[PDB]
Structures are given as structure tokens and as C-alpha cells.
């Protein structure tokens, strides 16, 4: 479910101020629709922006919001789209995080290919729109959230 097997000991991942972090995703069927994305938290609240694209790059979709994740043993959010975005099959995506604030929390043991119990395999991969750390392995964006139509 989680692009993650893990979670970094304590709160060691730097915002940046605002530098992206991203990550490029890929579906193998049909029918899918993102509403959302989970989000690492800690270090109180956070101020982002959050834009999903489609492959260079076009704009699909940007929120920008508050997040805290302070009251809860959570260490995750979940941020919510303002339109859902529809995928095409074996198209490559990306949604890029700007977040400003503390320290998070990150993912380590990140997963190239994540099966869904559904049938859908999702396709993780390194997106030259991050320059804040994340890829396939660690850093931000634990999570997809979607649902099949």
C-alpha cells in the first residue's frame, strides 16, 4: 500500500524550503483515479504545495494547504486533490512536493513495483523533478491514494 517497507529512525528529512521532492509513478491497467496523497509529517505544522504531472512535463493538478501530524501517532498525512486526476495506463506521472517547516519523518526501503491487492501494479522510478532527495528507495511521498473506476 505504502511505497515504503520502513520509516526512518526520528525526524532527520530537510524540507528544503520548499526544494522538491518527487516522485514518478506508473500504472498497469485502466480505470485508475488519484485522489490523493500521504505525505510525511513531524516537526509540527507544514505549509505545502502539491502538483501532479504528466510526461518534460505538464501541469495536472496543484493543491497547496496545512499539514501537521503532531496529533497523532501517525507520523503520516493524507492530502486530498481539489479535481481527481485520471491515469492512463503505462503513461508516466509525477507528483512533486514543495513543503516548508521542520524536519520529518522519511521512507527508507523504498519498492520499484508495488502490487496491489486489486490486480493494479504500480511502477515507482527516480523523477529528474526532485532535487531534495527522494527516488525510489527514501524520502517523501509514502502513498497513492486512489480508487478504480
Known amino acids: 500500500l505504502n511505497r515504503f517497507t520502513k520509516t526512518s529512525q526520528g525526524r532527520s528529512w530537510n524540507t528544503?524550503?520548499?526544494?522538491?521532492?518527487a516522485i514518478c509513478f506508473a500504472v498497469d491497467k485502466p480505470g485508475i483515479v488519484v485522489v490523493g496523497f500521504a505525505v510525511y509529517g513531524g516537526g509540527g505544522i507544514h505549509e505545502y504545495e502539491l502538483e501532479v504531472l504528466v510526461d518534460r512535463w505538464t501541469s495536472l493538478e496543484l493543491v497547496k494547504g496545512t499539514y501537521t501530524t503532531d496529533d497523532s501517532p501517525s507520523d503520516i498525512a493524507e492530502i486530498r486533490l481539489d479535481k481527481v486526476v485520471p491515469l492512463k495506463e503505462n503513461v508516466?506521472?509525477?507528483?512533486?512536493?514543495?513543503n516548508y517547516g521542520s524536519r520529518t519523518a522519511n521512507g527508507d526501503?523504498?519498492?520499484t513495483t508495488v502490487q496491489c491487492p486489486d490486480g493494479v501494479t504500480f511502477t515507482f522510478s527516480t523523477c529528474s523533478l526532485s532535487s531534495n532527495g527522494t527516488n525510489q528507495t527514501r524520502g517523501q511521498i509514502p502513498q497513492i491514494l486512489y480508487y478504480r473506476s
Open 109 to 111: 526501503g523504498g519498492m
Open 92 to 98: 508516466k506521472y509525477a507528483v512533486r512536493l514543495r
Open 16 to 21: 528544503g524550503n520548499g526544494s522538491p521532492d
